[PDB]
């Protein structure tokens, strides 16, 4: 029933971050204070085993016997910024956590009964079926979003529960409310260790242990109220009607006056009657399958896709109105000398528009990076199942739609080659171009935190790629030390496939038959002359050569994105 | 020597924002507290006369006689987020404030002596010549950036000094430091009125008056320590080791409550004597502002090594790439396609690289509002100075270096006028696109919406350029849209300059007559096939269309700045 998290002689380098630090965390409600420059948040990441174990130079023991390998699984860590998803209910978030974290042996009834128990302990009955939500669609208050995030780690019943600053970002009455909630939760035999940033007296009066940290040195460790009892014996009387936490942070900033400060306070405490008995206390001392994770990550990602009416509907609206505009400008393509220019221009516009609208695949792996790191090291899934699920539920149904609706709108308004295979090869080429551009987007933007640099990098890359398309330059006139760059051009393969599909068997000189022979050359009367003038093969291997080049680019870029996710700094 | 800012019966609508509010601000160190939902920041904006005077329904009096017209000139307002410019020193910021705010009669010696007096009062000798700076280039700490911003309004010697939350965003020891600085500054006979957000006891123990505000109602007004003396008499027993400011903000929420506390304040022994106290009751020229705004903007331009050097680097490497792909334009049937493609790429690249003129009038909007209503300059001088020192030297360079790189690598028409008309056309296209950028992005706060609006506008504009569509084949109910197209005028001028007098059929002379038409052998046939006039009025027709677009878009941007909500 008890859970003592002892720790002894913890030094750390990445910069000596944490100096000589000792301490015992009884099963009460423990607290870590200090300024932000000190190791207040670094000690919590060391004790929760989510900092990388190279620089750790001490033993963290749990009830005697040392810390196990999978310690992060039987534990909790409430991150400071909430990584709960807004476009879901509370009960669906708890179902996701219970389905990916509990065993596979219990069925829906017991898991629902546990979720009902957790949602009935924290008091979330009024919002048990409402969306969590941000200020983009109707959602709950920020005082219960935090306890929703707290309830996501109480499903596995941890005896030790870590929290990173559960008051930063909240208003006052809600902060007092969840502090009283944690105070009530602590007395069931659960160790609660948390950092906090400048608490008030109504929060400080309910602690059970205190750990002051400034510049990586230990200023105090003991009971919480004995800190006020102890700092008067060092020659620092606390003024009446003054907050003791503000008193400690003031006397540690040097602003308070007694009535190299950090080292001096460190060993004015090291030789006190609080260090010795703590030293005596120290001296007597996967879960699921691949298919299950794939199904659940894909289900949650698809619910988030249809629960966000920004990136799902507005893309379809702008695609439909752009198709109506393009079908209205190029209405009735004729076979004059201006029939070549209109066809080349509209096919260039399609293959450029696909690559430039596929630039918005940045925000697949950047706006949820912290959620991915947290749920990977918490032991939910593996990297390949997350990658396959996020891919299969976000890239496919939103890149396979605009090519279909775009071709179906513009193909009969323009009046292109009236066959069936000429329709379906055009649709397939637009699909492959969109998939190749989104694959390059994922290969560039994976493992990033800032969104802008990948968008600007892809912007200059796609400006360099569309010169080699075959419209602005003739690809048979570039010098041979430079013409090899055209094989790194997705719009070149798309434009070449569309031009080979469209221009074969056309006559563009009205009144003149130039198939048997061309009288008076420099005439460009046929479509085959236009294709050979651009450097395009006339055999049926040119079209599918472009298609297999696009498929190889898809496979290579997706493999690079997966290896960039797998080799991420996940700590 | 004293400066009492009295105020009496102040109601306000934009929503009744401020209810029945009375108060006296003695020349000490006054404080306004309360939650953020209350009128803590709204009363400070009402008393500082930088909220618009429609909804104000009471009299704010200064030493008796009412508030004058130019009250914001003989005053100070330290905004909460610092609008000081990082790419300048402290002494240059104080020189800018002293040159645009003091009189023109005093010369450099007395103004420098005043700046030395201010910089020697606030303790800025160690950073008097260092750049203020952000985390983009070496700069000073955030504890003296705030007092640098405080010193920018102490040049005109105000007797009343307003501050909007001088502790939000700072660390603790620095916040205590500038609070002790304001405490020392108050005892020279200077009224200091400020809002603050959740102070500690070491800050609360040095106040002189208090004004609690919750939901627009007055909860308390009097001396600061009598608030804890007063709240026990209402039946709120004060706990020891508790901060009194946290005690007031806690008993406002929980230890019709607001109305009830309002009229137990209203019938107390603090409301009556305050009611008795209430019942016994440009600077420069246009050329000077133009010179100083242009000088500060040019120093900020050369002090930021992002938008000045990297543009030139990407322009030089893009010119080297374009000169390497199109090396040696010949006169075959593929000589028309290469020329049309490279000229389309130049006129598209100018309009799309001129999209980054968003951040001229969006990333300094709050500084513009603050220094306009503080009485520095007028709108036309700011507009002309910012224009003349940011748009001209950074849009007139890439056309010159781009033409000088690509014109002889490509091998275009080897004359001098064909070189200079190309350079002039690229200049006019860049200026027209930046003018449309300023006309869209003026008076905005968010940066992204103007960039996306210009992006869809320039995608719609480059279809009408003359390359993707033949402009003589569009239906007549739709072809009138081509006159709203900057790349059409640029591309038409470049094509008329380039293609005249060229032969593209090798071995065939097609100037006297064209044997076997559908041949496109000459450049005049290519120009007439696109719809371009062959007279010398087509080129300069495109140029005067670009000049008219420049003038119209700059006038629209100036009228959008002048009609801004400047309050």
């Amino acid at each position, epitope marked *: 029933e008890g859970a003592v998290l002892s720790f002894h002689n913890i030094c750390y380098r990445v910069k000596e971050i944490l100096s000589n630090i000792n301490g015992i965390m009884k099963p009460g409600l423990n607290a870590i204070l200090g300024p932000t420059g000190g190791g207040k948040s670094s000690l919590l990441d060391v004790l929760a085993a989510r900092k990388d174990p190279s620089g750790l130079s001490g033993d963290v023991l749990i009830n005697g016997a040392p810390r196990p390998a999978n310690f992060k699984c039987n534990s909790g860590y409430v991150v400071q910024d909430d990584v709960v998803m807004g476009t879901l209910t509370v009960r669906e978030n708890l179902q996701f956590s219970a389905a990916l974290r509990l065993a596979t042996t219990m069925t829906n009834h017991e898991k629902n009964e546990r979720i009902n128990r957790v949602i009935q302990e924290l008091g979330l009955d009024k919002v048990a079926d409402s969306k969590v939500g941000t200020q983009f669609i109707r959602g709950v208050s920020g005082g219960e979003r935090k306890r929703t995030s707290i309830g996501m780690e109480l499903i596995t019943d941890p005896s030790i529960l870590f929290l990173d600053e559960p008051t930063t970002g909240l208003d006052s009455s809600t902060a007092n409310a969840v502090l009283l909630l944690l105070k009530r939760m602590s007395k069931q035999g659960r160790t609660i260790i948390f950092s906090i940033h400048q608490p008030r007296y109504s929060i400080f009066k309910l602690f059970d242990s205190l750990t002051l940290l400034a510049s990586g040195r230990l200023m105090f460790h003991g009971p919480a109220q004995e800190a006020l009892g102890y700092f008067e014996s060092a020659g620092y009387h606390c003024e009446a009607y003054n907050n003791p936490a503000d008193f400690f942070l003031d006397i540690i900033n040097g602003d308070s006056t007694a009535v190299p400060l950090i080292e001096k306070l460190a060993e004015i405490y090291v030789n006190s009657s609080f260090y010795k008995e703590t030293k005596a206390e120290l001296h007597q001392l996967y879960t699921t399958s691949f298919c299950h994770q794939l199904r659940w990550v894909s289900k949650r990602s698809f619910k988030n896709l249809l629960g966000n009416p920004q990136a799902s509907i507005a893309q379809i609206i702008v695609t439909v109105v752009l198709g109506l505009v393009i079908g209205a400008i190029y209405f009735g393509l004729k076979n004059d000398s201006t029939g070549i220019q209109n066809r080349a221009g509209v096919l260039f516009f399609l293959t450029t528009n696909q690559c430039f609208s596929s630039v918005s695949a940045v925000e697949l792996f950047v706006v949820e990076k912290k959620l991915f790191i947290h749920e990977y090291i918490s032991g939910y899934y593996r990297v390949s199942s997350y990658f396959l699920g996020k891919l299969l539920s976000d890239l496919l149904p939103m890149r396979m739609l605009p090519s279909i609706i775009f071709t179906c709108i513009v193909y009969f308004m323009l009046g292109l080659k009236p066959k069936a295979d000429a329709f379906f090869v055009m649709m397939f080429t637009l699909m492959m171009v969109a998939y190749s551009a989104s694959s390059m987007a994922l290969a560039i933007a994976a493992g990033q935190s800032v969104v802008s640099v990948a968008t600007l990098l892809m912007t200059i890359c796609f400006v360099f790629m569309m010169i080699f398309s075959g419209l602005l330059v003739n690809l048979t006139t570039i010098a041979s030390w430079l013409s090899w760059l055209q094989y790194f051009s997705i719009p070149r393969y798309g434009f070449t496939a569309l031009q080979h599909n469209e221009f074969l068997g056309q006559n563009f000189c009205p009144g003149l038959n130039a198939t048997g022979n061309n009288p008076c050359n420099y005439a460009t009367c046929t479509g085959e002359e236009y294709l050979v003038k651009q450097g395009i093969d006339l055999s049926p291997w040119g079209l599918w050569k472009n298609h297999v080049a696009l498929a190889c680019m898809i496979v290579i870029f997706l493999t690079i994105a997966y290896l960039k996710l797998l080799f991420l700094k996940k700590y | 020597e004293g400066a009492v800012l009295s105020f009496h019966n102040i109601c306000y609508r934009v929503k009744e924002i401020l209810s029945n509010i009375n108060g006296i601000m003695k020349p000490g160190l006054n404080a306004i507290l309360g939650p953020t939902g209350g009128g803590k920041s709204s009363l400070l904006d009402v008393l500082a006369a930088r909220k618009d005077p429609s909804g104000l329904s009471g009299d704010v009096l200064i030493n008796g006689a009412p508030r004058p017209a130019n009250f914001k000139c003989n005053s100070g307002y330290v905004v909460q987020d610092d609008v000081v410019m990082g790419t300048l020193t402290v002494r240059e910021n104080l020189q800018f404030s002293a040159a645009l705010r003091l009189a023109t009669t005093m010369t450099n010696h007395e103004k420098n002596e005043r700046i030395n007096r201010v910089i020697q009062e606030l303790g800025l000798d160690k950073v008097a010549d260092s750049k203020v700076g952000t985390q983009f280039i070496r700069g000073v700490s955030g504890g003296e950036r705030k007092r640098t911003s405080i010193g920018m309004e102490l040049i005109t010697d105000p007797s009343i000094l307003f501050l909007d939350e001088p502790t939000t965003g700072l660390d603790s020891s620095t916040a205590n430091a500038v609070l002790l600085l304001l405490k020392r500054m108050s005892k020279q006979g200077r009224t200091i009125i400020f809002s603050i957000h959740q102070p500690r006891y070491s800050i609360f*123990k040095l106040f002189d008056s208090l004004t609690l505000l919750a939901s627009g109602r007055l909860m308390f007004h009097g001396p600061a320590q009598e608030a*804890l003396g007063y709240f026990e008499s209402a039946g709120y027993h004060c706990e020891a080791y508790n901060n009194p400011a946290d005690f007031f903000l806690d008993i406002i929420n929980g230890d019709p409550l607001i109305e009830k506390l309002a009229e137990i304040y209203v019938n107390s022994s603090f409301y009556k004597e305050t009611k008795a106290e209430l019942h016994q009751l440009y600077t420069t020229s246009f050329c000077h502002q133009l010179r100083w705004v242009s000088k500060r903007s040019f120093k900020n331009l050369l002090g930021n090594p992002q938008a000045s050097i990297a543009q030139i680097i990407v322009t030089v490497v893009l010119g080297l790439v374009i000169g390497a792909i199109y090396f040696g334009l010949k006169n075959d049937s593929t000589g028309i396609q290469n020329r049309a493609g490279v000229l389309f790429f130049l006129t598209t690249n100018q309009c799309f690289s001129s999209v980054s003129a968003v951040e001229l009038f969006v990333v300094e909007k709050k500084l513009f509002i603050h220094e306009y209503i503080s009485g520095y300059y007028r709108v036309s001088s700011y507009f002309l100075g910012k224009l003349l020192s940011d748009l001209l030297p950074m849009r007139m360079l890439p056309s010159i270096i781009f033409t000088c790189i690509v014109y002889f690598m490509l091998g275009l028409k080897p004359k001098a006028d064909a070189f200079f008309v190309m350079m002039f056309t690229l200049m006019m296209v860049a200026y027209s696109a930046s003018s449309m950028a300023l006309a869209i992005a003026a008076g905005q706060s968010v940066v992204s919406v103007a960039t996306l609006l210009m992006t869809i506008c320039f995608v719609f504009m480059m279809i009408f350029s003359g390359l993707l569509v033949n402009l003589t084949t569009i239906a007549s109910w739709l072809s009138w849209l081509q006159y709203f197209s900057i790349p059409r005028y640029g591309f038409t001028a470049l094509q008329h300059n380039e293609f005249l007098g060229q032969n593209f059929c090798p071995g065939l002379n097609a100037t006297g007559n064209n044997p076997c038409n559908y041949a496109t052998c000459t450049g005049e046939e290519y120009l007439v096939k696109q719809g371009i006039d062959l007279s010398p009025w087509g080129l300069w027709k495109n140029h005067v269309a670009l000049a008219c677009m420049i003038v119209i878009f700059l006038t629209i941007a100036y009228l959008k700045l002048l009609f801004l909500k400047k309050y």
Partner: nanobody
Amino acid sequence: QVQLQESGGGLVQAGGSLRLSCTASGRTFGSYAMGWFRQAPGKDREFVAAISTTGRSTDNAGSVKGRFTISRDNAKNTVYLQMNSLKPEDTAVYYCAARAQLMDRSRYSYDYWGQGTQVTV
């Protein structure tokens, strides 16, 4: 911080003309609501008077009807305890204390004490 030092003493033998001045050595003096204590040899510490900060209220003992008068001024950091009609139950030593912000007619809450000075009746 905020150290107190008394000044006075003397002897008049019931002539009623004594006036002490407990000066506070500190930075911010206008927040402390202070008091005055007495102690003869053999008795316990007895409260006699207390003034508030930026004085608006006072507190008096039981043996003092209007006999004692306390005053202050935050510009010249001093509290004054004026006495008259010095009856013989006054032979004691007089301490000034200084609480946080409030009165508290008691002991063991006043922080920042002084050395006291002896009055001989």
